[PDB]
Design a protein around this ligand. Sequence first.
Ligand SMILES: Cc1cc2nc3c(=O)[nH]c(=O)nc-3n(C[C@H](O)[C@H](O)[C@H](O)COP(=O)(O)OP(=O)(O)OC[C@H]3O[C@@H](n4cnc5c(N)ncnc54)[C@H](O)[C@@H]3O)c2cc1C
Ligand SMILES: O=C(c1ccccn1)N1CCN(C(=O)c2c3c(nc4ccccc24)/C(=C/c2ccco2)CCC3)CC1
Length: 247
Amino acid sequence: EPTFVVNASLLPSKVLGLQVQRPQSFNYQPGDYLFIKCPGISKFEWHPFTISSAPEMPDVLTLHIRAVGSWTGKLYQLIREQREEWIRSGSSQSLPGVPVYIDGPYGTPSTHIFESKYAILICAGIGVTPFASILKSILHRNQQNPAKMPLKKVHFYWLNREQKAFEWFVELLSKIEAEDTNNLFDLNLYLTSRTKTGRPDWEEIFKDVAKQHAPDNVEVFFCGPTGLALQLRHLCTKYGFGYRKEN
Ligand SMILES: Cc1cc2nc3c(=O)[nH]c(=O)nc-3n(C[C@H](O)[C@H](O)[C@H](O)COP(=O)(O)OP(=O)(O)OC[C@H]3O[C@@H](n4cnc5c(N)ncnc54)[C@H](O)[C@@H]3O)c2cc1C
Ligand SMILES: O=C(c1ccccn1)N1CCN(C(=O)c2c3c(nc4ccccc24)/C(=C/c2ccco2)CCC3)CC1
């Protein structure tokens, strides 16, 4: 339970990459989320974040936080000010750590992606934190033993309207396309890396992946709004795929 924040990242758009000492009892799956208490902001509140580090990562957890309101802004400050006083001051013995409490892990149906043969992962919006975790572990599982893993093709389609806070995620995807030696991944990005503008024609993306994998079964993992959820379930049923909604 009791731990510390062992680094930060002042990532664009006020986003806060974080490094959290992973307790020896703390073993999580990909996409799992956390409840965190930082006493120096609130002695009382807990707040929830998805872990953005595959559980293959050894002895840290990375949390990409966005300052969007009180505790997250107060959080950002206790960092920039905690960091900016090691630059115009720089008393460099070693860095200290921000004591924080953590509660979890709490699960997601994501663990089923690793069990399925083909797979459509769709993030509409900004719930992309768990998908960064997932897509890393897929990398590691593919490397360490790609025969051991049923997941043979991952189709990733991402819809955001603006990526300023998410320039960290874009990089990470490019990395995945790099070490993706086996062409396990089909990453697509759409704006609402030369990526695609406008709404995707889902009728065709599903019609295409279908042909890619006949007569095998495909599983959809949707993570977005409900009016998109409905369109896809009708496509799932029209090509006989397999649907579930995360969050
Ligand atoms: C499962 C889960 C995973 C999450 N993962 C992440 C993650 O990876 N990264 C991350 O940054 N966050 C994540 N969050 C969100 C995070 O838990 C919250 O943003 C957190 O509580 C910080 O909120 P706050 O108290 O700092 O700001 P708040 O003051 O609570 O801000 C809440 C947001 O709603 C707005 N708002 C709503 N109603 C009003 C109103 N009446 N008046 C004014 N503003 C209003 C605020 O302006 C602000 O945008 C996650 C949440 C969940 C449930
Ligand atoms: O889809 C809905 C929604 C649903 C119903 C009604 C209205 N909106 N939202 C509203 C609630 N959000 C979250 O809590 C949430 C957030 C974030 N990351 C999440 C990851 C997983 C789960 C939630 C979040 C953020 C991540 C981030 C950005 C940059 C760096 O890290 C930013 C803060 C919000 C976002 C999606």
